[PDB]
Amino acid sequence: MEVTVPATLNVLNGSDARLPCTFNSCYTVNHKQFSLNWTYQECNNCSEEMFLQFRMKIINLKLERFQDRVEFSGNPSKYDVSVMLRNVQPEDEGIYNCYIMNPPDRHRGHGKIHLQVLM
Amino acid sequence: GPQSFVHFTKQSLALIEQRIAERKSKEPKPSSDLEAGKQLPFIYGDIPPGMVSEPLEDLDPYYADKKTFIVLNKGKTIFRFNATPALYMLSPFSPLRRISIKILVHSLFSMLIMCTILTNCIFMTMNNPPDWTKNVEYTFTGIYTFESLVKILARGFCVGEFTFLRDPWNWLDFVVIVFAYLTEFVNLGNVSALRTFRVLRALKTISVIPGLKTIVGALIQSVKKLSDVMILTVFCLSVFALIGLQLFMGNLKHKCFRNSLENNETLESIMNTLESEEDFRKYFYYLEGSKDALLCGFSTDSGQCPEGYTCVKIGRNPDYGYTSFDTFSWAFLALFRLMTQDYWENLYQQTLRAAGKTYMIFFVVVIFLGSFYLINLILAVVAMAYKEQNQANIEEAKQKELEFQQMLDRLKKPYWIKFKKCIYFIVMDPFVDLAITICIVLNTLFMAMEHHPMTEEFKNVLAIGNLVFTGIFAAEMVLKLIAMDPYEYFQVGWNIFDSLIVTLSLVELFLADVEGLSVLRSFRLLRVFKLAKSWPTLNMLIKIIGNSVGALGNLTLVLAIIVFIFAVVGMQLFGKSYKECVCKINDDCTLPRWHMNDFFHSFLIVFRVLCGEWIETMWDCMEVAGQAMCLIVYMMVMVIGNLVVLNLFLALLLSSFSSDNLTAIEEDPDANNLQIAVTRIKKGINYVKQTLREFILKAFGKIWWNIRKTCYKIVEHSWFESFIVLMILLSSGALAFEDIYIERKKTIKIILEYADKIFTYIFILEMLLKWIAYGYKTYFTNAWCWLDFLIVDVSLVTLVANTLGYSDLGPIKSLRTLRALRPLRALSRFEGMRVVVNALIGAIPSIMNVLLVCLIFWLIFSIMGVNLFAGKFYECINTTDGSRFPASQVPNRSECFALMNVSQNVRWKNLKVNFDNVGLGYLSLLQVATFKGWTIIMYAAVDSVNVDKQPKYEYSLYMYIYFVVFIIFGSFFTLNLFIGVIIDNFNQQKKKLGGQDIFMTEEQKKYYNAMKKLGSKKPQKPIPRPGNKIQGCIFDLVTNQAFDISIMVLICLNMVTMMVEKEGQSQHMTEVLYWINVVFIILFTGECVLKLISLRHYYFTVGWNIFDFVVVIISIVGMFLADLIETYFVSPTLFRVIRLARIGRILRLVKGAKGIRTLLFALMMSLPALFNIGLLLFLVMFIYAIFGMSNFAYVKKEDGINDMFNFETFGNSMICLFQITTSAGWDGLLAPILNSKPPDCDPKKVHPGSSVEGDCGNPSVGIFYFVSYIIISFLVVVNMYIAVILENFSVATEESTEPLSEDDFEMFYEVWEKFDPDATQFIEFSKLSDFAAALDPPLLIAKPNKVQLIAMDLPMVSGDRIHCLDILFAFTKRVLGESGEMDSLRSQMEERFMSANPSKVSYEPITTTLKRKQEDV
Amino acid sequence: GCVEVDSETEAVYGMTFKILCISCKRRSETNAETFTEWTFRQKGTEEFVKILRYENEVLQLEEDERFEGRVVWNGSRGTKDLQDLSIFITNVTYNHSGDYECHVYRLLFFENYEHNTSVVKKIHIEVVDKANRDMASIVSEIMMYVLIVVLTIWLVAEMIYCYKKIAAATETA
């Protein structure tokens, strides 16, 4: 599955960071079966923390590390699964992953963004 | 100028420019033989060694003025350029420009680039290329750039007249390299289409091969000649699509929904909340195994639905939604699919299930008019185009050859030798040829004895037989090898073939090569062609093959290139989609059986489209890759591929069967040693007869004749024949009633019994009467009386065996089924059927010889198929799901039976039509050659691992090659030969009865001539001008072309307003379309009223005016009667049939195009013959229908035999037979008739309400039935095709200009009055020499006129005088020629003369001028 | 396939007689579970009384003495999907004259759907003393004979007329 994300995303501290993610799946997005997991790790060999998941409806896990700054910013039926991180902080630097399953499409998609926080 | 060779030099250029300045200060065509691209005429001899490949001054004087210079290569090739500096930088003299010239025209300059192109092609057919291909792409681009640079470095870009950008092929390679560089050095994205752009490199083959530019030019010309037929096709399709949209709008949305819903639900909520395939199956009745829901219907002759379900019009259409008459666009698609007869039986059955079965009358007319007739028109026009072009080309070639010949004439004015001669005397050709050919036929019959369940003894028998034949073959090989010089032996092609085969056989013998037995079988089988020396038709088929690969090899090459290109582009655009979107076209998320994901399968799909099957692949393609591109691709493939294929086909036909053009052989040196040996053995046997008969002789009444004449008088009387015809019709019609419902109507049953008795009595009396008057000798020496005799004897035997009581005694029950031959008694009565019947018998000898050749060729193929697939088709399916088992479990037959023992619903089931022996081989080959049922056989073939091993998916993937080679040498080449022999035979027949039509009765001939007269009458009176100033001024306004043009534009707009009506339209659109129709009707009525006021009563003269009035009346009455049907009565079906009247106005568009009118007139003029053939075909349909009902009415409803479309009633049987008259679906009907044993059938099944038991059919009679029927129908439709093609060839060529105006008739009389002042209408032959010299052109005849005046064959009346009309007719014949109107004009001028001068005594001719001069000399 | 045929109406006294009651399904490919009841009122009385019931390959016969014995099953055997509810009378008497009612109770089986249907068929049975040949049969036989005779007569008439004509004309020359 083709997943389009910026490999590196550079955002100023305090600004809003939209993490763009779209995916080219031919099959129509069935909200009763579509799956999205947006996870976050600190390094390629570090632990992933799921912070948002599409199961029936958008589930925001409200991880303490993000406070209430995570928002969904996509539209699954339009093949957009982007997220928004409001008022970015230096600790938000790291790796963010968009996992995508669009049954009955066989292949799972994976986008990986390296978010860097500028002064 | 043989010594006109001059290095292009600066002084020559200065002279050019000087002369050009001379020309411009004072202010013809090029010799096509010196034109570039051609070859230098030999009149210049060899080239000086320093002159070749060097700028030479222009030879043609036409260009000798303009700045030009040519170069000739070492192959005498002419190459023109321009002397102007290229981009004002390179003078022709410059060394760089010279070296580029040297490189450009060089024989390594084509081979280089051609090899590169071919490697590029072989690199395009790569699904996922490795990374070598990146460097290879770079190098390819480099070579192309290098070539383009060399070209624009010796021709200039566009500065002058011989420059790079001039040739369109240079445009092609230019845009190729432009796109290449763009893609490679900008790298934007969407590389799919960008890479598709790189298939145009393949087109560069057409520019690097010498004979591939002329071919495409010819194709373009043949296309250009198709304008009228394209127009008529679009128009007819659109009209029929309007009809179908009117009659069927929304019918295919009929599914049957469950009556009882739960929990307060309705149709709207449900259709809103459901989206699945299971959820749809819960509420709508779906037949097991079907993606689309069962089409119910509202009428009583429509498909019924199970209790608990009501017919409702809701949901999407079937086939993913791509089949419906809901909108004009989808109706047009469906009708285009109907025109090409692609899978049209499914649309047929789906429309007859939703709408009533009475709606078939629409399919009959559509099939006949559209498919048959339009396709015949296309074939006719393409054949005329090709014929004439070929004829012109050959004529031009002959003229050039003649010129060349004329110019040539102008130029002229130890022990080895001993046993060698021994064995060469021993080669003994008059007998060993027979020996070895009998050996060959024996070998062929011997290999045709394999089957699947053989025994070991048979195996070793076959082994020893093959060994013996191989030894004999090698022995004859080595004998002829040593007997003739080995070099001489090897010289002869046939001996090369034989040696090849024998050597391959021996290689098979020696080592362990048993693996590839395919090649062994194939090669020893091909040996049969050695019979072509003594068999003319086999030799003709070999010639048809030789022509297609060696005289028309360029056309075949173009076909291969086009197929390759289409395959490649199909892979690039659609290949990824099939992998990504697979679950949308398949339930197991695996690629379907036909895809475009790699080159081989893409090629197979292109081949399928070429064969004729394109609708199904296209639906899957639309699902995975969108409608637009899929449609475009498939339509381009269809049209272009079919064009090229028909061109190749017709080229083969004309070239090969031009026997008269290929008959130049001298006296046969050796009548084949078959004939020599035949004479020798005849002499020998006559000898032996003589000596053996010698040894045998040594060892040992006025009442009777009156009765005869009376019976004659009776049985020849018209009342009698009419009565017998009536009885025949009554008897035949009484056979249509013994359906399976005969028990419900018992009174009719008894009536029919006694009527059969009466009919038998009448026919016996008639037979006795015939014997009494005709006599025994005359009665039995006929083919009709024997038929009647047989029929009446069968009936009499049945009657006597029923009255006696010994009925139901074995064969007596079967003999009763022969009552379905009673309709055959009508053949002798209707002359219309009789003419075509006698025509068909005339063709039987010629077809029989070809049928034999076809059978031999098929045997060569069926034996191969038997050696490849003997019993490998058995699979261990699951009966409930009908699904083959995964083959990872259940690998072999033993495992399948071990499964049977534990499970319950599995079978080790063989295919029904397989290759288990040459019989089923012939059957499978027939199915393949008709493209019906071919796919099922192919899937198993390519899935076959071994004899008892379970089939695996695409294990033998390349077996498709087998079917491809078959379809090419069977179906394509055999059909070519067939058509050729048929047209030759029909030409010979038409010539035999003296150039007359063979499909029309004598009465129809006169009707045909009268209907021909209606074409181009030509005497025209004026329509009267009105006396009244007011009426007259408006009349002038009414008859202007502007009014007509406006009316045509309104008719076109009316059509457009009709096209926009869809299904589910809002009330607003309904109302506004209603009102627009109202306004159109008003304007049409108005136009008519206005003309009836201006034109007075002269309106009803032109037939088109009468048609206009009728269509106006029908339109207005349709409108008002619809408005009354709405608010008084209630009928949906009749309402739409009434509204069908408005399509009448659309037909007025024919009034405009003079091109379409000719085609429709040809169709009309070819109706009677079509009518007679249709009568014969309907009669055959009736007899088969009755047999079918009697024999199959109780077979299992399996596949193609539904609740509808069975043989249970006459109507159903007819619907089935009309369907398979086009051969569509016959495989489907035949399949359930092949069940003859459990568990495929039950022979003890009780039918409620009857006494018949078994539900399975006798396979032998079923086969015979279907195969014979399709063969006969094929013959009949070939006859129809020939009829239409002949009539079109005639009509297109009937007329000539006849530019003689009436003033040329007056000047003929004004000169006549100067020599005959008495108006005696008779002039002396002596005065003819001057009368022809006093006429003005074109009737002028200059002195010496007498040489021509004798050759015109004028008759001479008593006194050596000639009549006026004799002289007039001879002169108009000289200027016009022999056209079809010429015999018609002579007719009308004579009858106008006979009615004016009843004095016939003075018109008798005693001699003619040609006969008179012969008497003079 | 299945055809609905109507039963005969005349029973020869002292003989056997088969009563037909056929009820075909709309679509043959469906599968159901049928059972039936038969009910008969005697000619001259007005009350329909049950006489039998057939289900699970067993015919349960009511104890009505008019049909004690004399009745056996004729429909489908071992199918549960009957489509034919005929019964057979042996040794017809005069008591068997009246009206017959053939109630079918089908139960179609669908995807997620079960439609308990029901049909009713009525028959009138009159017991005669001797089988009276049909009116249609005898009139058809008579028509056959008279047609044969009239066509033969027209034939012979034209024959004698033409014969006299030709024999006179040949002697005229």
Ligand SMILES: NC(=O)OC[C@@H]1N=C(N)N2CCC(O)(O)[C@@]23N=C(N)N[C@@H]13
């Ligand atoms: N399966 C096969 O033979 O493929 C070819 C094509 N496809 C079908 N599904 N058909 C239904 C029956 C049939 O004859 O096989 C056919 N009907 C036509 N007109 N061509 C065939």
Ligand SMILES: *[C@@H]1O[C@H](CO)[C@@H](O)[C@H](O)[C@H]1NC(C)=O
């Ligand atoms: C009907 O009844 C008769 C008499 O008992 C019996 O012999 C016959 O087998 C039955 N037939 C059927 C169709 O059940």
